[PDB]
Design a protein around this ligand. Structure first.
Ligand SMILES: *[C@@H]1O[C@H](CO)[C@@H](O[C@@H]2O[C@H](CO)[C@@H](O[C@@H]3O[C@H](CO)[C@@H](O)[C@H](O)[C@@H]3O)[C@H](O)[C@H]2NC(C)=O)[C@H](O)[C@H]1NC(C)=O
Ligand SMILES: *[C@@H]1O[C@H](CO)[C@@H](O[C@@H]2O[C@H](CO)[C@@H](O[C@@H]3O[C@H](CO)[C@@H](O)[C@H](O)[C@@H]3O)[C@H](O)[C@H]2NC(C)=O)[C@H](O)[C@H]1NC(C)=O
Ligand SMILES: *[C@@H]1O[C@H](CO)[C@@H](O[C@@H]2O[C@H](CO)[C@@H](O[C@@H]3O[C@H](CO)[C@@H](O)[C@H](O)[C@@H]3O)[C@H](O)[C@H]2NC(C)=O)[C@H](O)[C@H]1NC(C)=O
Ligand SMILES: *[C@@H]1O[C@H](CO)[C@@H](O)[C@H](O)[C@H]1NC(C)=O
Ligand SMILES: *[C@@H]1O[C@H](CO)[C@@H](O)[C@H](O)[C@H]1NC(C)=O
Ligand SMILES: *[C@@H]1O[C@H](CO)[C@@H](O)[C@H](O)[C@H]1NC(C)=O
Ligand SMILES: *[C@@H]1O[C@H](CO)[C@@H](O)[C@H](O)[C@H]1NC(C)=O
Ligand SMILES: *[C@@H]1O[C@H](CO)[C@@H](O)[C@H](O)[C@H]1NC(C)=O
Ligand SMILES: *[C@@H]1O[C@H](CO)[C@@H](O)[C@H](O)[C@H]1NC(C)=O
Ligand SMILES: *[C@@H]1O[C@H](CO)[C@@H](O)[C@H](O)[C@H]1NC(C)=O
Ligand SMILES: *[C@@H]1O[C@H](CO)[C@@H](O)[C@H](O)[C@H]1NC(C)=O
Ligand SMILES: *[C@@H]1O[C@H](CO)[C@@H](O)[C@H](O)[C@H]1NC(C)=O
Ligand SMILES: *[C@@H]1O[C@H](CO)[C@@H](O)[C@H](O)[C@H]1NC(C)=O
Ligand SMILES: *[C@@H]1O[C@H](CO)[C@@H](O)[C@H](O)[C@H]1NC(C)=O
Ligand SMILES: *[C@@H]1O[C@H](CO)[C@@H](O)[C@H](O)[C@H]1NC(C)=O
Lengths: 489, 487, 489
């Protein structure tokens, strides 16, 4: 009757979520957000990166000039997308260190080809084959020049091509491996052919190997592909007594942010900074679980499929009025912290805006820092493999597996530390509001232990409102309160 | 006389341990646990992984068919190579020996299937005195040394299609004679070629004739090569001479198998983690036994010890006194408790709830430190017996980078865990003290040393009500207010 | 008049600095230190590591014996410093796997060469060339032996060199590639040549390739360099039909902490444990941003150029006397925490030494724990590249980029956690001093809410000093204080 009760409390929800800390792996909070991107639209957005769909063409086949890949001449790309349906339909070939050539062309990001006037004296040029038709006529790789004898003669070829410019040149050349000895001599006169391509700083000599190889598109012969980069001021010198597959020029080789990716995802008209073989994914989350192969500004790949970041306080279900001691207020929806009172004029409830904003601001602060930083990668290493290789592939897999486990640990520890700090900061906001009310009341109230104060004087609605507003004057009620406290009963 | 003292305190031990945080590298706690496994039984447990002891045989020698390795014909989870292993057949080398050893070890089987290669016009199964099998000239069991017949060596051209649904691993070789007389007495022609190709690959090797140092009586050598044939693909072997032919193929699989160099004996026990020093337990999150591991293992760090605090901050004990700069070495039945003095004497009782609240949080931190498994199988090599250069430099650098990053994680993790353990145990002491204050209301006063001066007659049943949490302050309020605010 | 005010407070400065935590990326503190070393003297200190300046000589040219590199015979080093001005001035050559040979010689850290008496029967030794002048007369690599025909004969060379010692031997040998067929026969009689160098465990056979290569210092011919290590008990056997560039002995190969570094920084007479291509840097900070290429005891390379570690409390600008509640004391310069009072004899201010030392000791403790040594590296991988290589180079760059991003994250998280703990420990020292004063005053004072106490009795200078010293006896003033508190006004 002659007293009033003022209780301090915090909100609670009927649909909490479980998050993790260092101590507890299952603590319930009022709200949480997902830090692992796990879904993808399924399509590769054509912005902001220049996407080049290879369709039926590998990058190497477009480089060499497979007739069905003619549409890729002089193309440029930020990301070349190789399809699993791609195929070769020209002269059967292999590339020693196929992965390295594919990688350096993918990183260069252009197929800009410049024809140079190589003068091959005494030999027939542009040899054709039935296994490489262009317009239903025998043909060959567009960027290579199959040379063979003329008038039953094959004079030693010795041709120089100096780089008098200011950019590097990429030369693609080959060596022809016949099937039989009659084939070797009908094409190159001599029974053994040498091919030597050298600069001032390097030399490469290849000896053809004659022998029956399994039929591929009707042919038992093969061609081995090689490459050579000529620096400005350096000179390209090509020397051959036979089996030379000559270049028709050079490719402009650049240094850029371009790469290549194996994917069957369709190309879509959208904008997304991050691309995976599953399609583009958003980068609003710090981590992702779609694919370890990424291109562009991406979240970091982790092994966990979900990592829940607490964005509210610990959810304590609700138990006269009572305070926050082992009791949450599911009826308080307009704020995270508030006051419940009971006086002579009834009861009421009001939220505290400052302490509510103080907790939201700290959580929005962790979010802005969790969604920050730079993981924008371009050409990296390969991470899936279709053949068994051994040592080099063992090291490539180990590096990536080591990397993923280290970032999985970082993500796991980061969320647990963030959640514990979120729990502590929200618990401190409740304590700071309780202690601020204690200091206002001075000797006019007593801590009841359950988060409520027993105010030892008649405190009407204007009096309760002054405590909530922070304008409570304890000298006004001190004499009345001291009498109610220290009275004999 | 008319008052009583009630003190809050925590336990203390006479044998504390020193742990580290970020501020203090040497803070004493009541108890600690070791997070780094440093010891090993010394033996490799034969469970749960299928262990294959190589004894005197390397994996490559068992693959090719060294006569003293015949017992390895046709599986393993881990092949254990001994340092006492030796070769006792035809002297040989393997270009990219490490990769072939790796892919066979990863496949985890030596299942060999004979195929009927028909070699027309040549003599098969050539033997040598440097590869005796039963005291007779012999050769690698899985290879077929071909040479001339009737002073003729017609060009070999043999196809072997893969009409099945699994991959085939073919192991073949090329023979390098010592002199020209040897080259022609065996292969007629003065030079030779071996070409093994599929639809997607080709390998051509030219023999090299020349004197090489004597090894088991022979100056000649054999270079070993391999080729994988996919289903639908075709193996084609073309040779002018010096061909060491395969007798079939090895079934190549994709599994969790690996290989390890170790001299540790095999034991009849069960252990998920194997190191070259022997199996180690995986009850701790980190280990310092060996960076080479197989199975579900703790992560390798450089530190030999990392102590995780499992008890509160140890304060030696200095009338009764509270917890302020004072621990209670006499309290053995609990971590926190009450000491009182009234008209009926003194007493001490522990608080079970706060004691369990601190133990549960420490058991909670423990659980989470033995959860996220590190189960690796075939990896990279981490020790090397020859100088190689660029590739070996990268392999060492990768492993050294990894160990330094996990060593930092382990160092930071324990320091953060210990600081939180110190803070949570300090908060349990403060919460019990604040819980007691709220019960006493205006019937007591904080003496500053963790004790309360209770300003009323509080007998044993009254002290017990404070400890149980059923203390009624209205009963003693009038008496207490008279003792507090008296002149 | 009959009362006194005692305020608890902390210091503040007019020149605060901004540090980062997990919540706030911009919190102002009174003092901070830089954890990233970003500057360098620009010179390489010649202590404590033995520095060998290569000047005009690459390590490979000093190994082979380029005449202008004669001053490097039998040299030793902890770090070989290659200058960009280096050049070759002998027979034009190439090294298959040049990077691996350069690496293993650099790691061995010595060029100690021991001449061995190879007996080459029937051939002329020490062939010279105009492209390798030594003292203005035709010469050759000092450590190699160019063999050619004698009396128009080149009998098959078959020479053994057993390792009868207890250390490994490093043999450097070569193969000569002529330009024309007449050159091949004028020097080696036969039209082709084989070179086979083998031990009991390895064999290497090289076939020369005849052909025109671009002119380098007047010559179209080349020499390919190879190496072989012979273990104790093993035997070196050299078999050659022609074109052999023979060794004159072996290099002692060691296992040490030596390495090689490309740098143009000048050598200086100073002492520094850490060396970068930019020069020596101090290792007083845990992280550095000068160069990812390091040698010796170094800070760890990160991407951030600055990381400020808070070394003081949160700086709160100063707003009767008032306490620490939303108020710092810029007038307190002799301590971090202190007392401000007002009694009948005036006002005063005094610092608290114990709480000030308790906060400084914890901060000095964190500083020391950040300089514990785990990064002393020597020979590592290469991290810059002047040519395009592909797969192996991609993996080398990816490994280093993976490493830097992981340590950059560690540094970022470490400083944010350290700063938050420093803020928490400095705030706790302020609260503990306030609660310590509360316990002394008992019922003789009341918490005013702003960090000050209202002392309800006459408390002169000797009485205030007892509270500051910790020897305040509340029983002396209890009766006087109770009458002032619970009086009717
Ligand atoms: C060395 O042996 C191989 C394998 O026995 C021989 O290759 C085979 O050559 C025949 C043609 O002479 C190929 O047959 C053709 O097959 C196609 C489609 O299968 C068919 O349309 C043609 O009418 C013809 O039958 C056969 O594919 C091919 N086998 C392989 C695996 O490529 C090779 O000719 C022999 N070489 C010498 C020099 O003896
Ligand atoms: C080229 O020179 C090498 C080096 O001398 C010759 O190899 C050597 O060949 C002899 C052949 O009689 C080997 O001798 C044998 O040594 C064993 C082992 O102790 C001994 O028990 C035998 O009774 C015999 O004396 C010698 O070991 C071997 N040395 C090496 C390093 O392999 C080779 O014969 C020469 N070839 C030509 C074409 O000149
Ligand atoms: C194959 O073609 C190359 C390219 O023409 C020939 O090499 C060239 O040979 C000439 C004459 O030996 C070199 O000329 C010399 O050039 C220097 C300038 O550095 C000049 O001062 C000399 O007086 C002389 O003119 C020319 O530099 C050289 N070119 C290159 C790129 O190396 C080679 O001779 C041909 N081989 C055959 C077998 O025909
Ligand atoms: C809980 O329910 C409310 C009401 O629809 C909803 O707005 C909120 O996002 C839910 N959140 C969770 C994580 O359950
Ligand atoms: C719940 O948390 C997420 C993460 O911050 C936030 O996006 C959302 O607005 C929050 N919801 C509530 C119910 O206010
Ligand atoms: C790709 O190949 C398919 C099937 O051969 C053909 O229908 C299609 O036109 C090709 N696409 C292009 C762009 O050439
Ligand atoms: C993403 O794609 C890869 C195969 O392209 C697959 O292994 C993975 O499970 C996919 N998952 C999601 C969520 O996209
Ligand atoms: C302290 O001694 C007890 C009793 O012998 C023992 O059980 C306990 O494990 C010891 N603890 C430490 C940290 O030494
Ligand atoms: C290799 O195994 C055989 C067969 O037991 C044995 O006699 C020989 O001495 C072994 N070598 C060892 C065990 O060092
Ligand atoms: C185990 O590993 C190697 C040899 O296996 C060597 O360092 C030592 O003998 C052992 N060290 C440890 C820590 O067990
Ligand atoms: C000390 O800690 C360990 C692990 O937390 C526990 O197994 C052990 O029994 C503890 N000892 C005591 C006396 O608490
Ligand atoms: C602030 O100014 C003083 C006065 O020169 C100086 O000693 C101190 O280092 C400065 N601190 C900061 C953080 O600027
Ligand atoms: C390096 O070569 C240049 C040019 O010939 C010469 O002037 C200089 O003195 C040389 N330096 C040394 C240290 O021999
Ligand atoms: C260190 O050297 C490299 C190469 O000159 C340069 O890119 C980098 O900016 C330099 N940084 C400093 C701080 O000297
Ligand atoms: C500022 O911090 C540094 C690092 O702790 C310390 O050396 C210096 O004494 C501090 N300066 C002041 C004015 O306290």
């Amino acid at each position: 009757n002659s007293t009033a009760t003022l209780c301090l409390g915090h909100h609670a929800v009927p649909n909490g979520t479980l998050v993790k800390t260092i101590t507890n792996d299952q603590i319930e909070v009022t709200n949480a957000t997902e830090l692992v991107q796990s879904s993808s639209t399924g399509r590769i957005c054509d912005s902001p990166h220049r996407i080049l769909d290879g369709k039926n063409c590998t990058l190497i086949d477009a480089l060499l000039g497979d007739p069905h890949c003619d549409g890729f001449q002089n193309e440029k790309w930020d990301l070349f997308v190789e399809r699993s349906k791609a195929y070769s339909n020209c002269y059967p070939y292999d590339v020693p260190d196929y992965a390295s050539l594919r990688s350096l062309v993918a990183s260069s990001g252009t197929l800009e080809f410049i024809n140079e006037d190589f003068n091959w004296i005494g030999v027939t040029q542009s040899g054709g084959s039935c296994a490489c038709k262009r317009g239903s006529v025998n043909s060959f790789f567009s960027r290579l020049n199959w040379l063979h004898e003329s008038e039953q003669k094959y004079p030693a070829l010795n041709v120089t091509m100096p780089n008098n410019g200011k950019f590097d040149k990429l030369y693609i050349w080959g060596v022809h491996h016949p099937s039989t000895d009659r084939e070797q001599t009908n094409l190159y006169v001599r029974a053994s052919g040498r091919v030597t391509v050298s600069t001032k700083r390097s030399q490469q000599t290849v000896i053809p190997n004659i022998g029956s190889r399994p039929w591929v598109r009707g042919l038992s012969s093969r061609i081995s592909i090689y490459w050579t980069i000529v620096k400005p001021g350096d000179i390209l010198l090509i020397n051959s007594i036979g089996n030379l597959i000559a270049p028709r020029g050079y490719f402009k080789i650049r240094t850029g942010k371009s790469s290549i990716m194996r994917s069957d995802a369709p190309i879509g008209t959208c904008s997304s900074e991050c691309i995976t073989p599953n399609g583009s994914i958003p980068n609003d989350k710090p981590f992702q679980n779609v694919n370890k192969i990424t291109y562009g500004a991406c979240p970091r790949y982790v092994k966990q499929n979900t990592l829940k970041l607490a964005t509210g306080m610990r959810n304590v279900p609700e138990k006269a009025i009572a305070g926050f001691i082992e009791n949450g207020w599911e009826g308080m929806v307009d704020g995270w912290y508030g006051f419940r009172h009971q006086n002579s004029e009834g009861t009421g409830q009001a939220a505290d805006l400052k302490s509510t904003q103080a907790a939201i601001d700290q959580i929005n602060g962790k979010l802005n820092r969790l969604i920050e930083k730079t993981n924008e990668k371009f050409h990296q290493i390969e991470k899936e493999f279709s053949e068994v290789e051994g040592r080099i592939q063992d090291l490539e897999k180990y590096v990536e597996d080591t990397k993923i486990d280290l970032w999985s640990y970082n993500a796991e520890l980061l969320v647990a530390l963030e959640n514990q700090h979120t729990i502590d900061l929200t618990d401190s906001e409740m304590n700071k509001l309780f202690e601020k009310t204690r200091k206002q009341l001075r000797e006019n109230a007593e801590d009841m232990g359950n988060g409520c104060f027993k105010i030892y004087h008649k405190c009407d609605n204007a009096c309760i409102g002054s405590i909530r507003n922070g304008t409570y004057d304890h000298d006004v009620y001190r004499d009345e309160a001291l009498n109610n406290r220290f009275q004999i009963k």
